[PDB]
């Protein structure tokens, strides 16, 4: 959904400028949390392992 | 390039749906050309 809506918004935004560029494709790469909470997230993963 | 990109997008969406339908054991133990054949004949036709 994020990729589809991003592509739609990007082509709609590009259209008024009337540049020669045609939007071939937009693809999602990563949705990581910020670095300050990366420790909290991977600690949650470690706790999930630590239970077993 | 444009055709390759379109193929990537369509196949990725179809495979994501199919692999979301199944679990890890069904896609790891016994594929036997079942998920892959479904993806192939869903690409060659308008099946969804």
Rounded Cα distance, A35 and A33, in Å: 7
User: Token pair for residue A49?
Assistant: 């392992």
DSSP per-residue string spanning B24-48: HHHHHT--TTSHHHHHHHHHTTT--
- Are A7 and A26 within 8 A, CB to CB? yes
Inter-chain contact A24–B9, Cβ cutoff 8 Å? no
Rounded Cα distance, A11 and A16, in Å: 9
* Cβ atoms < 10 Å from Cβ of B40: 13
User: Token pair for residue B2?
Assistant: 């444009």
What resolution in Å is listed for this PDB structure? 3.3
User: How far lies A33's CA from each of A39, A41, A46, B31, in Å?
Assistant: 10, 8, 17, 34
- Are B11 and B17 within 8 A, CB to CB? no
Inter-chain contact B1–A25, Cβ cutoff 8 Å? no
Main-chain dihedrals φ then ψ at residue A29, nearest 5 degrees: -115, -60
Rounded Cα distance, B2 and A33, in Å: 33
Torsion of CA B30, B34, B35, B41, to 10 degrees: 170
Work out the end-to-end distance of chain A between its first and last CA atoms, rounded to an integer number of angstroms: 35
Rounded Cα distance, B3 and B5, in Å: 5
Chain A residue with CA closest to B6: the answer is: A25
């Amino acid at each position: 959904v994020i990729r589809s809506d991003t592509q739609r918004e990007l082509e709609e935004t590009i259209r008024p400028y009337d540049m020669g560029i045609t939007l071939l494709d937009v693809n999602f790469q990563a949705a990581r949390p910020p670095e300050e909470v990366k420790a909290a997230f991977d600690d949650a993963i470690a706790a999930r392992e630590n239970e077993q | 390039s444009q055709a390759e990109v379109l193929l990537k997008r369509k196949f990725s969406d179809r495979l994501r749906s199919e692999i979301g339908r199944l679990d890890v054991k069904d896609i790891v133990t016994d594929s036997r050309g079942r998920l892959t054949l479904e993806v192939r004949d869903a690409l060659n036709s308008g099946s969804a």
